[PDB]
Amino acid sequence: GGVHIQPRYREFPQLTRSQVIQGEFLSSLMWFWILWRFWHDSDAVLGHFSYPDPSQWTDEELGIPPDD
């Protein structure tokens, strides 16, 4: 009636089954998705292309001539 969820005074509000399950549900799917994609597609941190060391290019390759 006037009480759909009894108010509580200085006590931990009682929680409904659904409130807890839906909350764990949304969070757990968040973690399943993060884990699933991390496994299937781990190119979020690494990147799938390795930076070349610009300082290891034989001068020949770069057309650097030998002081004429």
């Binding site: 108010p7 005074y9 931990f12 839906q22 909350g23 949304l26 969070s27 799917l29 979020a44 930076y51």
Partner: protein
């Protein structure tokens, strides 16, 4: 749109469930009292902080590394990255004060979020916040010819700065609990009264624009 909408309705849930308290100071421990919104709030918070593999991550780090790779103002490049760490900080500020702390709400507690009209939409957007970045990025037409080739520090900069951001704020907030009031308001005031643009440019312009009409243009 997906995550910011979530966080605001998440706080809509907290404000309405509490006796219309709109201040983080009097709200606390919503995580145990209301797990459904707290779960939605952290999902949104991590999306805002660009958690890897969530909707923010697919678009946001593309923008970050774009900056780290283009020719740009040095001042702009540095501020945008620390702006990203601050986004983690204030994101941390909300969950620590609003969710992970001893409750400080008024003593009678009457919290209900069971109403389908609360959960359903919050639930539906949460599904969008979790999967939208995945769907939109793959489906859109190839565009912009991104540069995926970066030194690894720049490739992972968005991830680390966000992490370090949370860590720093965790430390700061946790430091707060000590029985030691020593904030000293070093620069909090700028930050707290909005950089003082509101205090000064809102009192001078409306004052020297109306004084001139009544006193000078109208009567003189």
């Amino acid at each position: 749109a997906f995550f910011k909408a979530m966080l605001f309705m998440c706080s809509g849930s907290i404000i309405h469930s509490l006796a219309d308290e709109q201040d983080i100071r009097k709200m606390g421990n919503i995580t145990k009292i209301m797990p459904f919104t707290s779960s939605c709030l952290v999902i949104g918070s991590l999306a805002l902080t660009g958690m890897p593999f969530l909707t923010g991550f697919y678009s946001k780090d593309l923008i970050i590394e774009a900056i780290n790779t283009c020719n740009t103002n040095a001042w702009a490049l540095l501020i945008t990255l620390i702006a990203t760490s601050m986004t983690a900080m204030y994101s941390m500020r909300i969950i620590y004060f609003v969710t992970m702390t001893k409750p400080r709400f008024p003593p009678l507690i009457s919290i209900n979020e069971n109403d389908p009209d609360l959960m359903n939409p919050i639930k539906r957007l949460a599904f969008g916040s979790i999967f939208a970045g995945f769907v939109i990025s793959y489906n859109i037409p190839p565009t912009s010819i991104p540069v995926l080739t970066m030194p690894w520090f720049l490739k992972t900069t968005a991830l680390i700065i966000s992490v370090l951001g949370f860590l720093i704020a965790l430390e700061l907030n946790n430091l707060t609990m000590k029985l030691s009031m020593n904030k000293a308001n070093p620069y909090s005031s700028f930050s707290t009264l909005l950089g003082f643009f509101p205090s000064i440019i809102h009192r001078i312009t409306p004052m020297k624009s109306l004084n001139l009409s009544l006193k000078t243009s109208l009567t003189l």
